[PDB]
């Protein structure tokens, strides 16, 4: 009877509400005013605040826990940004953050309960097992490449101010790793899209000839020799989802 993407939506307003009164994070309740913070969309690439996440919510845009505390992150990750990592302002975000985390934790058994109602693929032990495989290659495979740090994480546009400009259609392997952990991939396929697209951004940034596409050329085939190895298993964990999903 009752649909548990209110039930979650309930919740996660519930802890907006209470992060919102915490002291002094008016600051973060609202959007910047990026006219007069005129600077601000030169550093920041994805803003948020309370009242954006709380709209988000209320769109049904959720399904899980993981999805509203990566866009809940954001406002800290922003501060710590343009203000600076011990800049009251980061301190305040930080605060929300880890009243979110403590009310997250008093709930996850309740949480984890409306999560599979509303997709009941993470509680499929082959999804499971599948994500982790995955997440493995990335972190003993793909980042184990010397030198592929440029490759880690998103590029911060205050330390490369124009990536944005030619990347619009960015990735990188914690991006990776945050999709596998909301069990974004049901077979490979999809993964190498988003392998692929590290590979073709650094053409387009840094050229076919230099040093970084050379690193992430060798991203791309460690990732491409560790699925061969691995294709029996994977492939019947792909044909398992598949029936799974069927049935959902
Ligand atoms: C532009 C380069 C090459 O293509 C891939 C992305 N790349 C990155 C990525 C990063 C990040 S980061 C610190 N989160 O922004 C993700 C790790 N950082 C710097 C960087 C930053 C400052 N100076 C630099 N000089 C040369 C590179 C460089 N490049």
Redesign the pocket.
């Known amino acids: 009877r009752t649909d548990p993407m209110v039930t979650l939506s309930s919740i996660l307003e519930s802890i907006i509400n209470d992060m919102r009164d915490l002291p002094n994070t008016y600051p973060f309740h609202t959007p910047v005013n990026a006219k007069v913070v005129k600077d601000y969309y030169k550093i920041i690439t994805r803003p948020m605040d309370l009242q954006t996440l709380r709209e988000n919510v209320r769109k049904r845009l959720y399904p899980s826990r993981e999805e509203f505390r990566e866009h809940l992150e954001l406002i800290v990750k922003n501060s710590a940004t343009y203000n600076g990592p011990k800049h009251s302002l980061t301190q305040i975000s930080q605060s929300m953050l880890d009243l979110c985390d403590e009310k997250l934790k008093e709930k996850e058994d309740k949480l984890a309960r409306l999560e599979k109602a509303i997709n009941p693929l993470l509680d499929d032990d082959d999804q499971v097992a599948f994500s982790f495989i995955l997440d493995n290659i990335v972190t003993q495979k793909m980042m184990a490449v010397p030198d592929s740090?440029?490759?880690?994480?998103?590029?911060?546009?205050?330390?490369?101010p124009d990536?944005y400009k030619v990347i619009v259609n960015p990735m990188?392997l914690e991006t990776i790793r945050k999709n596998i952990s909301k069990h974004k991939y049901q077979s490979r396929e999809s993964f190498l899209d988003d392998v692929n697209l590290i590979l073709a951004?650094?053409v387009k940034?840094?050229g076919p000839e230099?040093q970084?596409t050379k690193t992430?050329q060798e991203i791309v085939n460690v990732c491409y020799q560790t699925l061969t190895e691995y294709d029996e298993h994977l492939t019947q964990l792909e044909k398992d989802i598949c029936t799974a999903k069927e049935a959902a």
């Not at 740090?149 to 490369?160: G, L, R, T």
Request: glycine residues 0%; without cysteine.
């Open positions: 740090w440029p490759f880690h994480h998103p590029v911060n546009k205050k330390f490369v990536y990188d951004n650094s940034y840094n230099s970084y992430a």
